Amino acid sequence: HHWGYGKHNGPEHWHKDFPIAKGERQSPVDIDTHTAKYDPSLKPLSVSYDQATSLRILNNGHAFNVEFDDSQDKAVLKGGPLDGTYRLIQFHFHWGSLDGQGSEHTVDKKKYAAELHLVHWNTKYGDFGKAVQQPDGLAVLGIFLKVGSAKPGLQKVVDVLDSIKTKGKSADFTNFDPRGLLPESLDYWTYPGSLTTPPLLECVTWIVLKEPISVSSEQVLKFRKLNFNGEGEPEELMVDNWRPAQPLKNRQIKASF
Ligand SMILES: COC(=O)CCN(c1ccc(S(N)(=O)=O)cc1)c1nc(C)cs1
Ligand SMILES: [Zn+2]
């Protein structure tokens, strides 16, 4: 009886195996844009993905992960609200059964169709597994997806999905450039939070871009053809793999703009 998104193992049950689910800095949150404070001391976000080395794409039974080479100083995030240098390790998405839901963060209660998370770890801690034990261990860049015009930079991901339909399946996935997933503007909101899946560790500086990217109906439809089950098991479509908004508690959301 493992965690998941279903009626019997979803977000409302996670606290039994992961008490920190009811903690003081859980994610995601609703971003109330009128209460977010503009902070002129915030720096532009520096996204340096020119040398990124993707390696593989994996269905982990919750989402799909695009994994990177994080053994050298390639694909880093810095500036913004961050101190020091955070290295990209992987990206993944959360999405809905319908276009009207799927994001984890919300903006004045608006749900987007999906949300991309680019996960980075603070190089001060030497690798990811040590970083997640620290309050400033990770930086997750969150980007909303809306349904409209296709995102040509996403198509390479979409097209490989049929090769990893089921949990545990992986495919070589080299030479994918995550710059093709970014909107034009890097304006953002930021706050201290957590992983949005178990183990729900309170280690993340969240950086959520204001501008969504557009993907097509057909692209998201292919995300919703994935399966949460393994091969040879009854089919459970991979949809609604998002945790809803958690209490803000003693936090402030800051705006770069
Ligand atoms: C003990 O730590 C974890 O399991 C975090 C799990 N996870 C993950 C899960 C969710 C998110 S989210 N949804 O908060 O961005 C980030 C990281 C990742 N593990 C690796 C090795 C890369 S990303
Ligand atoms: Zn995520």
From 17, 144, 195, 203, give the residue whose CB has the most ligand 1 atoms within 8 Å, as the site to mutate. Answer: 195
Technique employed here was X-ray
Task: Please tell me the number of the ligand nearest to residue 70's CA.
Answer: 1
Residue 131 Cβ inside 6 Å of ligand 1? The answer reads no
CA of 195 to the centre of ligand 1 (A): 6
199 lines ligand 1 (CB under 6 A): yes
Residue carrying structure tokens 């991901």: 157
Question: What distance in angstroms lies between residue 93's CA and the mean position of ligand 2's atoms?
Answer: 6
Which of the ligands is closest to the CA of residue 28? 1
Q: Which of 230, 191, 225 is nearest to 4 (CA)?
A: 230
Contact 3, 14 (CB under 8 A): yes
Does the CB atom of residue 241 touch ligand 1 within 6 A? no
Task: Look up residue 212 and give its two tokens.
Answer: 């969504």
Can you tell me which atom of ligand 1 is nearest the CA of 243? 13
In our burial notation (b when 16+ CB lie closer than 10 A, e otherwise), range 202-234 reads: bbbbbbbbbebbebbeebbebbbebbbeeeeee
In the chain, where are the structural domains located? Answer: 1-257
Q: Which ligand is nearest to the CA of 60?
A: 1
User: How many angstroms separate the alpha carbon of residue 148 from the centre of ligand 1?
Assistant: 29
- What is the position in ligand 1's atom list of the atom closest to the CA of 195? 14
Q: Is the CB of 54 under 6 A from ligand 1?
A: no
Q: Name the resolution in angstroms.
A: 1.1
Take residue 120 and report the two structure tokens written for it.
Answer: 């980075």
Alpha helices by DSSP H, listed for 127-252, are 128-131, 155-160, 217-223
- Binding site for Zn(2+): what residues are annotated? 92, 94, 117
Looking from the CA of residue 27, the nearest atom of ligand 1 is 14
Q: Which active-site residues does the annotation give?
A: 62
Dihedral sign for Cα atoms in the order 159, 162, 168, 172 = negative
Q: Which of 167, 182, 179, 216 is nearest to 60 (CA)?
A: 167
DSSP string, 186-211: --EEEEEE--SSTT--S-EEEEEESS
Cα angle value 58/145/129 (rounded, 5°): 40
* 192 neighbors 125 (Cβ within 8 angstroms): no
